[PDB]
Coordinates of C-alpha atoms and ligand atoms in Angstrom, one line a residue:
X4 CA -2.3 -40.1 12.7
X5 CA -2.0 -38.7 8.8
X6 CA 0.7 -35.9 8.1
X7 CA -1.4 -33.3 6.8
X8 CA -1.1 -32.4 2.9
X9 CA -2.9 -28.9 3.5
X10 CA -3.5 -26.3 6.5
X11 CA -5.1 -23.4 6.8
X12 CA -3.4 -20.0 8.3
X13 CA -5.3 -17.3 9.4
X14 CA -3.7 -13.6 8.8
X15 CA -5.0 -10.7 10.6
X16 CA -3.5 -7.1 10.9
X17 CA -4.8 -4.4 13.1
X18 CA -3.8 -1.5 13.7
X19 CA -5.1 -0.7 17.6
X20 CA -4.4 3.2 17.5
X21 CA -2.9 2.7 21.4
X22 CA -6.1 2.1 22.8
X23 CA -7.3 -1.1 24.2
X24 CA -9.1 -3.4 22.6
X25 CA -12.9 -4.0 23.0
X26 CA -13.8 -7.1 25.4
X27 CA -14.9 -9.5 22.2
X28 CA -12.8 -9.3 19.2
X29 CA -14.0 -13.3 17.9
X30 CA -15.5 -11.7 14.9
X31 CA -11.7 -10.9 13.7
X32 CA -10.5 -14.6 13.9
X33 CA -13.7 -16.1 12.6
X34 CA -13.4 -13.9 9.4
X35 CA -16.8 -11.8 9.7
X36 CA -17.9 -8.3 8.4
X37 CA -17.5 -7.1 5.3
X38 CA -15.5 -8.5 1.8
X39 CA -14.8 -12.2 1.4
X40 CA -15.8 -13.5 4.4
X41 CA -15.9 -17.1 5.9
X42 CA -19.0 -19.7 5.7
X43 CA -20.7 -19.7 9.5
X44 CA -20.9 -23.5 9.2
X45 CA -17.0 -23.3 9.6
X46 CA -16.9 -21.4 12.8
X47 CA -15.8 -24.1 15.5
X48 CA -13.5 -25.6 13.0
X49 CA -10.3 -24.3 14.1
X50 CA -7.0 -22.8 11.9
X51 CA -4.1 -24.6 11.8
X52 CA -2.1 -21.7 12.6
X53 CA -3.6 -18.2 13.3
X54 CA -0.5 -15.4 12.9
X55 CA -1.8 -12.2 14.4
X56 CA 0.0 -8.5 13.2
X57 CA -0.7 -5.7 15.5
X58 CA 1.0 -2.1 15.2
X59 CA 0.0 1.0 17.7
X60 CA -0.5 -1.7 20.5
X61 CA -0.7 -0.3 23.6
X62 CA -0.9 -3.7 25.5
X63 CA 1.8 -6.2 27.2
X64 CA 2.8 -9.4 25.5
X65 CA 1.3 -11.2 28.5
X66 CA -1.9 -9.2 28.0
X67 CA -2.0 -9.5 24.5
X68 CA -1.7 -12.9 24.7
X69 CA -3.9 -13.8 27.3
X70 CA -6.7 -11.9 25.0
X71 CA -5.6 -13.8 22.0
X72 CA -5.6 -17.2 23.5
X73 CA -8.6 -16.6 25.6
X74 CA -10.7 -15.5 22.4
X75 CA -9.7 -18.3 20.4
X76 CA -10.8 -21.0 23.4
X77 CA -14.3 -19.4 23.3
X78 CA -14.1 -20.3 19.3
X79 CA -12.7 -23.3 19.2
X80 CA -12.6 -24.8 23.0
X81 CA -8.8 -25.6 21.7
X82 CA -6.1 -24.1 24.0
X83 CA -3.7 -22.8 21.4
X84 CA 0.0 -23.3 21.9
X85 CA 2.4 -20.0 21.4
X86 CA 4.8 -20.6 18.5
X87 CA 6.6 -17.2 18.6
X88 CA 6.0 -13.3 20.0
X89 CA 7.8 -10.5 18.9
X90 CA 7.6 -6.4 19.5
X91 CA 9.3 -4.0 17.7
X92 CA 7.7 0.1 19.9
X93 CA 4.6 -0.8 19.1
X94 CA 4.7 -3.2 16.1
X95 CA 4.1 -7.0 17.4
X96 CA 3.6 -10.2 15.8
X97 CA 1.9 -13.6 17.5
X98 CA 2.0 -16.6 15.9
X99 CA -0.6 -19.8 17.6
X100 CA -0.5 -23.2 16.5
X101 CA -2.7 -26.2 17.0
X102 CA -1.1 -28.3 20.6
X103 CA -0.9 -31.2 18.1
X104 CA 1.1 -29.5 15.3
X105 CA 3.9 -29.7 18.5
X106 CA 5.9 -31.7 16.5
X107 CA 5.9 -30.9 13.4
X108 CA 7.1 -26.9 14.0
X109 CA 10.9 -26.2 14.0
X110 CA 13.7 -23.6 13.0
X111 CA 11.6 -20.8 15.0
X112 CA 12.9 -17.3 14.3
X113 CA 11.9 -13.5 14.8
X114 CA 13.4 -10.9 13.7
X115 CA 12.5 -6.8 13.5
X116 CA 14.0 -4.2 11.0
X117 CA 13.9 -0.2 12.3
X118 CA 13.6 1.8 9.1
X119 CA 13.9 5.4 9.3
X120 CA 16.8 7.1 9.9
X121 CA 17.3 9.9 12.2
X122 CA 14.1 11.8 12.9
X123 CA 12.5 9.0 11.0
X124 CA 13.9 6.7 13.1
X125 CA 12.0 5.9 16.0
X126 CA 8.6 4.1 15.6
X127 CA 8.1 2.3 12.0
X128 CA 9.3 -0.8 10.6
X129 CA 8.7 -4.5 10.8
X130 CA 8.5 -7.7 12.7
X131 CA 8.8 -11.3 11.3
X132 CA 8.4 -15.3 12.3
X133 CA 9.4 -18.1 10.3
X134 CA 9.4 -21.7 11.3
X135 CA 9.2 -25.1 9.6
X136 CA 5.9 -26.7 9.1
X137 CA 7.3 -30.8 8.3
X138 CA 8.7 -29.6 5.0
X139 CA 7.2 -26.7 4.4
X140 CA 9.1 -23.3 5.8
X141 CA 6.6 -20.4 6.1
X142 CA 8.0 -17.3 6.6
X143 CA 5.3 -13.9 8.2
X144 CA 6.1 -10.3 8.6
X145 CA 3.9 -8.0 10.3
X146 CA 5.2 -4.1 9.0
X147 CA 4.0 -0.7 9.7
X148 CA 5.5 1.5 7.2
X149 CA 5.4 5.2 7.1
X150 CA 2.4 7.7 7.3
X151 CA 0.6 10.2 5.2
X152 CA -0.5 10.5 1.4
X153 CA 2.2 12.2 0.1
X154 CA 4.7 9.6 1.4
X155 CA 4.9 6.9 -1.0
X156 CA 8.0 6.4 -2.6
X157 CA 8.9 6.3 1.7
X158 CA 6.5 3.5 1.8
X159 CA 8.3 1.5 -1.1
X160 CA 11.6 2.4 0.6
X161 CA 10.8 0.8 3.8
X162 CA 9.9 -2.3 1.9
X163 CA 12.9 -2.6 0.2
X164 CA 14.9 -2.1 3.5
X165 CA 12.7 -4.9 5.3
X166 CA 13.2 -7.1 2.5
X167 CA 17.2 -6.6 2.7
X168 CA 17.0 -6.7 6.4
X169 CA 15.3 -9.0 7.9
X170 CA 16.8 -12.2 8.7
X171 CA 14.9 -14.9 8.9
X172 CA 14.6 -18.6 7.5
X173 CA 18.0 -20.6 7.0
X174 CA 21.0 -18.5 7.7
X175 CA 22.6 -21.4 4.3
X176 CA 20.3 -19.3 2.3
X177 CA 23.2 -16.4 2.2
X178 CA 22.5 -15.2 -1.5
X179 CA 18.7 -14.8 -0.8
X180 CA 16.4 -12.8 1.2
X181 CA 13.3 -13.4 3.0
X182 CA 11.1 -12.7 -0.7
X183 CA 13.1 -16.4 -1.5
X184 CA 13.6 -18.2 1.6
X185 CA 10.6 -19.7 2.4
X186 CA 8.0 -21.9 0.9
X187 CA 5.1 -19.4 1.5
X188 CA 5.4 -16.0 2.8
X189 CA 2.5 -13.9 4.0
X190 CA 3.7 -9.9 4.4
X191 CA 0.8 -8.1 6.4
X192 CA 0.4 -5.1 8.4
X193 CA -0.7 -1.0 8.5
X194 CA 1.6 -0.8 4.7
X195 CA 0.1 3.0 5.3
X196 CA -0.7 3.7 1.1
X197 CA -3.4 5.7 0.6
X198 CA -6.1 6.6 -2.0
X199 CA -4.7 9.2 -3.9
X200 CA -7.6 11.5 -5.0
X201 CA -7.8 15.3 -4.0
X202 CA -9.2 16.5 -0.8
X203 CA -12.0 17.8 -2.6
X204 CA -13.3 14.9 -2.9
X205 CA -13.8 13.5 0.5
X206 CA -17.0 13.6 0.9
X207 CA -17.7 12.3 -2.7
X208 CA -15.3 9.5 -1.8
X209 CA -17.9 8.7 1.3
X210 CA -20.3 8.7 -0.8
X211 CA -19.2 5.8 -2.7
X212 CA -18.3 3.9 0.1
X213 CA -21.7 4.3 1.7
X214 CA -23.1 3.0 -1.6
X215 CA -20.1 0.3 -1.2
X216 CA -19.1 0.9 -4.6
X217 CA -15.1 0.4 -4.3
X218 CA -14.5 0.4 -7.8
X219 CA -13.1 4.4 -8.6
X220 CA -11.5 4.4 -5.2
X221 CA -9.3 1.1 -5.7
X222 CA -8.0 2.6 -8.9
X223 CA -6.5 5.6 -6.8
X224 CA -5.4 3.1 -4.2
X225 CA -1.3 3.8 -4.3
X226 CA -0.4 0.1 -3.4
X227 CA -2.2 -1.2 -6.5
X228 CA -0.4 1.3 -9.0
X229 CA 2.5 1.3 -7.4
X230 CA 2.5 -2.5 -7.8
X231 CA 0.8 -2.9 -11.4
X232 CA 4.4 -0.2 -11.9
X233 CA 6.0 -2.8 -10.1
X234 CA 7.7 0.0 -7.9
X235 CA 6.4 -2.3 -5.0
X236 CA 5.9 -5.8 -3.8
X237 CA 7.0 -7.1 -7.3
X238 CA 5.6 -11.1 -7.5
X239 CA 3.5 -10.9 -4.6
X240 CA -0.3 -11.6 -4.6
X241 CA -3.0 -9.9 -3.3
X242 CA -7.2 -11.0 -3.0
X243 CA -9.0 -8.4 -4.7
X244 CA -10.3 -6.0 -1.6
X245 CA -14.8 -5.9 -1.6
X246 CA -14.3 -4.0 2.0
X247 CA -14.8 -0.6 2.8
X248 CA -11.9 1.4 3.5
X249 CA -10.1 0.2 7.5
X250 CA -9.2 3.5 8.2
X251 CA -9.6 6.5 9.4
X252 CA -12.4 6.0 11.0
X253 CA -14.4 8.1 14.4
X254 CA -14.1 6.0 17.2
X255 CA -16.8 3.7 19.2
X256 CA -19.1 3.7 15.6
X257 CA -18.1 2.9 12.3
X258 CA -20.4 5.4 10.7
X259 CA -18.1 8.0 10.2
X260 CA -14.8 8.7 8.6
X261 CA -12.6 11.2 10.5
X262 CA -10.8 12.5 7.6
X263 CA -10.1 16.6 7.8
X264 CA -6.9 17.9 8.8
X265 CA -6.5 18.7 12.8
X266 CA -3.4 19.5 14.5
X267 CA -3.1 15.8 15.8
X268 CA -2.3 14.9 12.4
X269 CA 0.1 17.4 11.9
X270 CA -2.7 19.3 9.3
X271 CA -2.9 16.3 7.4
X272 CA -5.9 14.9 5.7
X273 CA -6.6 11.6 6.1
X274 CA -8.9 10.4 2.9
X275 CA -10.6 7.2 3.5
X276 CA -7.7 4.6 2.8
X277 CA -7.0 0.9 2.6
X278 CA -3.8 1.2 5.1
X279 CA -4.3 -2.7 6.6
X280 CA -3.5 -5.4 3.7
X281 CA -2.4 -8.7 3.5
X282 CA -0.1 -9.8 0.7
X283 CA 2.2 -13.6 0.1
X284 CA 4.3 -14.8 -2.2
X285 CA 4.3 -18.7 -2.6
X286 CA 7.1 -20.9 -4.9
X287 CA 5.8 -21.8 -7.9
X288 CA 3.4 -24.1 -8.4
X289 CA 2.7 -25.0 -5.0
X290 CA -1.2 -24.5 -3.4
X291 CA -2.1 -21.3 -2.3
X292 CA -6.0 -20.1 -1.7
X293 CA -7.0 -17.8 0.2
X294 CA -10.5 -18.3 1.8
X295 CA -11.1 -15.3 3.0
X296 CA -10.0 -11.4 2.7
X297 CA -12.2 -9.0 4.6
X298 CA -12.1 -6.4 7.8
X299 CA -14.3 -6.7 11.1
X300 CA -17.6 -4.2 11.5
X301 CA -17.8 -4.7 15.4
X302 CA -14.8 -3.8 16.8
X303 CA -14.5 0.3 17.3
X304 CA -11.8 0.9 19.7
X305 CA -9.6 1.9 16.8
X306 CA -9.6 4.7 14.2
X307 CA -8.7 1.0 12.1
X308 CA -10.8 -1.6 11.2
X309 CA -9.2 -4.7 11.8
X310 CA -8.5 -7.1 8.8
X311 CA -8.7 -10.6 8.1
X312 CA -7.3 -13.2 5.5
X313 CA -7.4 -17.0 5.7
X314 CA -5.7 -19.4 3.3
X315 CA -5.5 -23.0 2.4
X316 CA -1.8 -23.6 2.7
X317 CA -0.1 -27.0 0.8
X318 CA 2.3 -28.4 2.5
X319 CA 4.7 -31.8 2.7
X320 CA 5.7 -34.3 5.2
X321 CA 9.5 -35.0 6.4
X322 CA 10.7 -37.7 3.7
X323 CA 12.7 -40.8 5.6
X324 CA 14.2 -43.1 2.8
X325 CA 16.8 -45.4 3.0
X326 CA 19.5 -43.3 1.7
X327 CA 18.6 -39.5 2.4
X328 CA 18.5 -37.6 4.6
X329 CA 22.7 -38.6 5.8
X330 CA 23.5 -39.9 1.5
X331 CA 22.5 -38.6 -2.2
X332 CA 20.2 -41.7 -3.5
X333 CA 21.9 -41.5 -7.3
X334 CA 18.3 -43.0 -8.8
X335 CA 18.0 -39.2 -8.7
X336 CA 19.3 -36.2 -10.8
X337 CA 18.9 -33.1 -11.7
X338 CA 20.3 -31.6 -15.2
X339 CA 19.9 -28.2 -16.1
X340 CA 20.6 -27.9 -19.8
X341 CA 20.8 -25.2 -22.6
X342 CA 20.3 -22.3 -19.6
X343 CA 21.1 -18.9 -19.8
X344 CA 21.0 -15.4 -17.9
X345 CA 19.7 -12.7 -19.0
X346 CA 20.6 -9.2 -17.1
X347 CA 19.7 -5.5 -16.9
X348 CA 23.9 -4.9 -15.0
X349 CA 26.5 -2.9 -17.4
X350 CA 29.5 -4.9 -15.4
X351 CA 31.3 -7.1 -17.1
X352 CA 32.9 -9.6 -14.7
X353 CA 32.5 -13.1 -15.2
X354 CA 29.2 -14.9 -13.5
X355 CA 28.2 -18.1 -11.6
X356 CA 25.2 -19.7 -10.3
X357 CA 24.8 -21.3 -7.2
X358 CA 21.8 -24.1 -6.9
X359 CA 20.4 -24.1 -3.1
X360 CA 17.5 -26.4 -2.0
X361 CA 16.5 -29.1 1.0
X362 CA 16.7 -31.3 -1.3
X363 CA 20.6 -31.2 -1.4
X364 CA 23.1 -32.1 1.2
X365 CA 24.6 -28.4 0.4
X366 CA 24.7 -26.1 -2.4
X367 CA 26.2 -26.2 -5.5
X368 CA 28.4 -23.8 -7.6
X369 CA 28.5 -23.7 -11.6
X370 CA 31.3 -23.3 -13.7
X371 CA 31.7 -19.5 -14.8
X372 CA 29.2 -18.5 -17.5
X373 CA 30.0 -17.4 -21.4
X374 CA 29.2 -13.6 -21.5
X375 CA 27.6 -12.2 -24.6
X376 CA 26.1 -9.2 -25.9
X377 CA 22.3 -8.9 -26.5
X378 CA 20.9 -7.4 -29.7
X379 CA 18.5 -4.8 -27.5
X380 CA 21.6 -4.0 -25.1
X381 CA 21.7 -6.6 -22.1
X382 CA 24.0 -8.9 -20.8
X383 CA 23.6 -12.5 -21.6
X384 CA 25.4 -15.4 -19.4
X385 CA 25.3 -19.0 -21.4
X386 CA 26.3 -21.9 -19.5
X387 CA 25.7 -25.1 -22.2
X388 CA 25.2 -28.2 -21.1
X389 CA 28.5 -27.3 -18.6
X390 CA 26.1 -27.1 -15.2
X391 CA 27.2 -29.1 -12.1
X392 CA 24.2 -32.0 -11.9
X393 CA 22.5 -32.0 -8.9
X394 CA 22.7 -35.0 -6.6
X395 CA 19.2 -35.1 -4.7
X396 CA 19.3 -36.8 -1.2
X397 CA 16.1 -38.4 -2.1
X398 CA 15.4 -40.1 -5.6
X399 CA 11.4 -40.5 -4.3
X400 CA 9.1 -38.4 -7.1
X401 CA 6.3 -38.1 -4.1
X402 CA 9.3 -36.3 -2.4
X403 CA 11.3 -34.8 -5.4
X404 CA 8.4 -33.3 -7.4
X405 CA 7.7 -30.7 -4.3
X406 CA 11.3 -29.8 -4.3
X407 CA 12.2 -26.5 -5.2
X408 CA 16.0 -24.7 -7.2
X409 CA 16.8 -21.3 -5.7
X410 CA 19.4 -20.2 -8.0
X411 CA 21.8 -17.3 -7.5
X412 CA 23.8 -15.6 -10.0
X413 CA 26.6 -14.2 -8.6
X414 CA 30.1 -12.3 -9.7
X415 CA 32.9 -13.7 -10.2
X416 CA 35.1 -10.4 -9.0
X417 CA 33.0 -9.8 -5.8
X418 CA 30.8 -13.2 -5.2
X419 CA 28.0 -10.6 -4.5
X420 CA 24.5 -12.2 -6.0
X421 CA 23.5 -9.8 -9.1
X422 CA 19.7 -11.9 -9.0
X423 CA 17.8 -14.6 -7.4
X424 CA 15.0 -16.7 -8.8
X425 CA 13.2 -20.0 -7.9
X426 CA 12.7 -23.2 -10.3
X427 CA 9.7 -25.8 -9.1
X428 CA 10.6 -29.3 -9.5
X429 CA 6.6 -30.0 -10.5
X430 CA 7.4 -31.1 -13.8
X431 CA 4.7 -32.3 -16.3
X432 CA 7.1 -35.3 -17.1
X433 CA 10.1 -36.8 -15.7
X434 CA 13.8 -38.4 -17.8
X435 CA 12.2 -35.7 -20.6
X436 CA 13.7 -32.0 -21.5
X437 CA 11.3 -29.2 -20.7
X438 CA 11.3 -25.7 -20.7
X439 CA 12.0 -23.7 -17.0
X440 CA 12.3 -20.0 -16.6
X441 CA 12.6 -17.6 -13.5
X442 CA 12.7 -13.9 -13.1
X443 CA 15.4 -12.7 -11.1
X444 CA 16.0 -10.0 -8.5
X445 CA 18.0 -8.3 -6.5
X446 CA 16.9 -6.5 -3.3
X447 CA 13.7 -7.2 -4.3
X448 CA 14.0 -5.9 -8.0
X449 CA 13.6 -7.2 -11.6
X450 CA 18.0 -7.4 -12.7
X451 CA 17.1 -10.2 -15.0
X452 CA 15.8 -13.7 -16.2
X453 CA 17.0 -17.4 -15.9
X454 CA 15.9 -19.6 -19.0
X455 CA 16.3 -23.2 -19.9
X456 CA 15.8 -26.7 -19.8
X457 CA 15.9 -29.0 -17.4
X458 CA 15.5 -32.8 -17.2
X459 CA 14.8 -34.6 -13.6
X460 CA 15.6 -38.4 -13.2
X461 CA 13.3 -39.8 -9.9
X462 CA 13.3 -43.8 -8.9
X463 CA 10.5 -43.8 -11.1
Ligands
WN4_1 C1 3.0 -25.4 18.6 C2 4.5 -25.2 18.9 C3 4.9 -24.1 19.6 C4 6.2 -23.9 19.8 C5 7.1 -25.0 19.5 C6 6.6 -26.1 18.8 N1 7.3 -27.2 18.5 C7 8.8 -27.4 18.6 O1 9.6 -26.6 18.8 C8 9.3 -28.8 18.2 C9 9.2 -29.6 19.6 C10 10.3 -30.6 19.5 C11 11.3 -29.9 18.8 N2 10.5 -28.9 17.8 N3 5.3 -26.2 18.6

């Protein structure tokens, strides 16, 4: 029986509003309603792995599950196996896998980050899975960030604090958080940003949904700008939304939006909004494609619609040679050559890199950089043709080209990572000098850039 090269994931985020939920809820998981929905001749044709984001649940984990499992029986007639639950209040995250991808899942961890502090403290924040897939590590987080229009540098604050916080994937991985550590890395959930247009205009803004033109409203939408100002979810990816707004909608029908202050919101207006997204980050150059990006019509126990997302995920087997894993297998190398740094800090202490991957037996530290000024102000770190090279367990090019370089540029004085970036080992060529680059980030944020060459000797 093959090792797959490719599975699909199903990502879905609802937002229950403590109610129960309806008795058929199949139209979530088989990606129907409105947007980018799936093909009805792929129906019975079950995910690989379905990763399910809830926040406001009212239920159990034994009832939630039961539902869940139960629904995707009827679809499928496969009795899905429970890779991980996890609850943070009212913020829970299931993950389901095939019973024959048994094997191949490892490394399971969950984790939750509480972000408020104080009176904010108390019922937002996150949840998150990660596991092994073969090689592939795939990390999930399921957040519900903080409420109301007005509240979005809040929003972008509970991000970063997730990001930070959040400990999942390998524990080696200590200079990098969960934006690094995984292969793929879906981020999903009630992210609460609004579309930022007076209150006015409510019921011109129903008016354009009702003609489903989306257009003037996603302009507003205070995720997009704050990511195209890269305030926010900086290198993530989204589908381009062709759904109505998910919330807030009357209850039991979806024909009304329930926007106008009332003292259950605390006065607030809530303007028809695209709370419930789904967003990944993938290393470079490996397969991505999402098949689907859309919310349900049919289920109305909520004042949110629930939302969908499916992608095709690449992935790679466990590589056995004769040498790796347990030795290095010296037909391979990898030189990086001619590479510098390039940073926004005003330190001055001295700088080295650190090279983590799978594909070494452990990481590796550099040499301290040569610090020079920039001609527009910045920091520059040179390291020649002076970088430790890298002794890959396995010299294979089927195995080596899917490898992946974190690097981490860290202080000398305090050995605390000043950025983080990621080099792909999918070269156009192999024994020949080509051009690699990296942004690099700290907590999330741009500090800086990684630029060279690099030259990668397989067994062939
Ligand atoms: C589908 C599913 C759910 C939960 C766990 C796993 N698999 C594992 O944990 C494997 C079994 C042998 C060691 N690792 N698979």
């Amino acid at each position: 029986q093959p090792e797959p090269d490719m599975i699909t994931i199903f990502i879905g985020t609802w937002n229950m509003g403590n109610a129960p939920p309806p008795k058929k809820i199949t139209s979530w998981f088989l990606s129907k309603g409105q947007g980018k929905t799936r093909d009805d001749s792929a129906d019975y044709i079950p995910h690989d792995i379905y990763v399910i984001g809830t926040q406001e649940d009212p239920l159990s984990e034994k009832e939630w599950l039961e539902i869940l499992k139960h629904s995707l029986q009827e679809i499928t007639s496969v009795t899905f196996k429970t890779v991980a639950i996890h609850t943070l209040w009212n913020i829970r995250i299931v993950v389901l896998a095939k019973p024959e991808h048994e094997n191949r899942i490892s490394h399971i961890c969950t984790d939750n980050v509480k972000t408020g502090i104080a009176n904010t403290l108390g019922n937002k924040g996150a949840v998150g899975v990660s596991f092994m897939f073969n090689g592939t590590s795939l990390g999930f987080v399921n957040s519900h960030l903080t409420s109301g229009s007005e509240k979005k540098l809040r929003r972008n604050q509970n991000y970063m604090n997730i990001l930070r916080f959040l400990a999942l994937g390998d524990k080696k991985l200590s200079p990098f958080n969960i934006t690094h550590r995984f292969t793929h890395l879906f981020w999903f959930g009630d992210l609460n940003y609004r579309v930022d247009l007076p209150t006015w205009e409510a019921e011109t803004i129903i008016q354009k949904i009702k003609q489903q033109q989306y257009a003037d409203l996603l302009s507003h939408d205070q995720l997009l700008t704050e990511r195209r100002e890269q305030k926010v979810f900086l290198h993530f990816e989204e589908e381009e939304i062709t759904f109505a707004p998910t919330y807030r909608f009357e209850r039991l029908t979806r024909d009304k939006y329930a926007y106008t202050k009332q003292k259950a919101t605390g006065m607030k207006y809530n303007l028809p909004s695209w709370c419930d997204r789904v967003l990944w980050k993938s290393y470079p150059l490996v397969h991505v494609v999402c098949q689907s990006y859309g919310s349900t019509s049919d289920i109305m126990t909520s004042d949110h619609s629930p939302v969908f997302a499916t992608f095709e995920a690449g992935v790679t087997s466990q590589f056995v040679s004769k040498n790796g894993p347990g030795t290095v297998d010296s037909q391979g190398q990898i030189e990086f050559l001619r590479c510098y740094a390039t940073l926004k800090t005003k330190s001055q202490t001295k700088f080295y890199l650190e090279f983590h991957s799978s594909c070494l037996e452990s990481f590796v530290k550099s040499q301290e950089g040569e610090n020079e000024e920039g001609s527009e102000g910045e920091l520059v770190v040179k390291f020649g043709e002076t970088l430790p090279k890298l002794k890959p367990i396995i010299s294979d090019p089927e195995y080596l080209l899917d490898q992946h370089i974190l690097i981490s540029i860290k202080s000398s004085d305090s050995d605390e990572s000043y950025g983080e970036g990621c080099i792909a080992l999918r070269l156009e060529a192999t024994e020949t000098q080509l051009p690699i680059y990296t942004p690099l980030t700290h907590h999330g944020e741009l500090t800086g850039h990684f630029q060279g060459e690099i030259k990668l000797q397989t067994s062939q």
